Amino acid sequence: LDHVRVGVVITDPALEDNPIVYVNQGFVQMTGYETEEILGKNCRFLQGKHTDPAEVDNIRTALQNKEPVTVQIQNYKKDGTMFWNELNIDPMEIEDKTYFVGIQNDITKQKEYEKLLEDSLTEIT
Amino acid sequence: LDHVRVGVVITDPALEDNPIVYVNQGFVQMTGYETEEILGKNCRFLQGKHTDPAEVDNIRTALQNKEPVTVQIQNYKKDGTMFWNELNIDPMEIEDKTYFVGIQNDITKQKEYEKLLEDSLTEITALS
Numbered sequence: 471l472d473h474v475r476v477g478v479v480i481t482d483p484a485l486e487d488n489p490i491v492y493v494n495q496g497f498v499q500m501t502g503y504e505t506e507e508i509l510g511k512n513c514r515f516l517q518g519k520h521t522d523p524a525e526v527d528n529i530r531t532a533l534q535n536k537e538p539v540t541v542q543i544q545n546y547k548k549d550g551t552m553f554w555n556e557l558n559i560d561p562m563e564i565e566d567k568t569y570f571v572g573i574q575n576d577i578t579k580q581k582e583y584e585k586l587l588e589d590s591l592t593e594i595t
Numbered sequence: 596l597d598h599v600r601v602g603v604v605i606t607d608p609a610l611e612d613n614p615i616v617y618v619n620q621g622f623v624q625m626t627g628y629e630t631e632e633i634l635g636k637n638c639r640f641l642q643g644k645h646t647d648p649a650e651v652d653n654i655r656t657a658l659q660n661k662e663p664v665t666v667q668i669q670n671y672k673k674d675g676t677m678f679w680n681e682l683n684i685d686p687m688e689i690e691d692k693t694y695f696v697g698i699q700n701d702i703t704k705q706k707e708y709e710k711l712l713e714d715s716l717t718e719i720t721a722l723s
């Protein structure tokens with residue numbers, strides 16, 4: 471119970487709207503969506519009210535150009551909780567066919583947990 | 596604690612000895628091998644003296660069963676230094692074909708820290 475784990479997705483851009491075709495349990499736990507509530511969707515489903523449209527634009531462009539991209543973007547869990555998602559996307563090839571691998575980091579949580587350790591270690595003196 | 600990128604590897608178990616067909620830069624950085632020195636190999640090439648056969652067994656069994664697995668296993672960089680690899684492998688299906696995807700997290704500093712806190716807890720408790 472309660473751990474920080476990276477989220478990993480693979481999407482298939484040869485399919486309609488570049489859907490997620492693989493997701494790790496880390497991302498299930500990070501976002502609050504079950505595996506089958508993630509698979510088959512475009513990753514944009516995690517965006518919401520305060521997602522910066524300019525950074526969404528910059529992802530779209532990167533993916534169009536098959537350029538690796540890293541960006542911090544506001545994302546939303548199934549229960550509505552906002553989190554900062556540090557997203558790295560890598561274009562890649564498997565069957566001499568292109569896929570995208572995304573690695574997601576819950577920066578909000580990584581900070582929260584590092585501070586708990588920080589504050590604990592203080593309390594020891 | 597550890598502050599490095601995670602490694603991702605994809606293998607194709609339909610090819611002989613389940614070779615690596617994709618590796619990200621996170622794993623290049625972590626292992627000290629360039630992509631050209633990784634692709635086409637089996638991931639076991641990162642193992643060495645202190646790699647516990649029990650954990651190798653755990654991985655071998657899960658892949659044979661086509662089931663997810665997580666282990667903490669000792670691996671080695673090209674320069675010979677040992678790192679602790681918290682390794683998660685899932686099967687996956689891409690365009691109706693099966694592959695494995697592996698996620699590698701360097702937990703060497705966390706393990707060092709855990710050991711010290713564990714020792715201190717043991718020591719505190721032995722006292723009054």
Ligand SMILES: *[C@@]12=NC3=[C]C([C])=C([C])[C]=C3N([C][C]([O])[C]([O])[C]([O])[C]OP([O])([O])=O)C1=NC(=O)[N]C2=O
Nearest residue numbers: 481512513514516517526529530559570571572574
């Ligand atoms: C989602 N991560 C993610 C991972 C990969 C491998 C890829 C290809 C995309 C994402 N997205 C971005 C999203 O799918 C989309 O590409 C962008 O919104 C831009 O395109 P549109 O059509 O919307 O203009 C990710 N988006 C997220 O918000 N969070 C991530 O984890």
Ligand SMILES: *[C@@]12=NC3=[C]C([C])=C([C])[C]=C3N([C][C]([O])[C]([O])[C]([O])[C]OP([O])([O])=O)C1=NC(=O)[N]C2=O
Nearest residue numbers: 604606637638639641642651654655695696697699
């Ligand atoms: C290697 N990671 C890794 C990633 C994937 C996707 C797969 C399928 C395997 C690995 N391995 C395990 C290794 O290749 C092998 O399966 C095991 O050694 C068990 O089989 P054998 O024949 O050797 O008994 C990984 N092994 C590692 O040591 N480090 C990883 O990062």
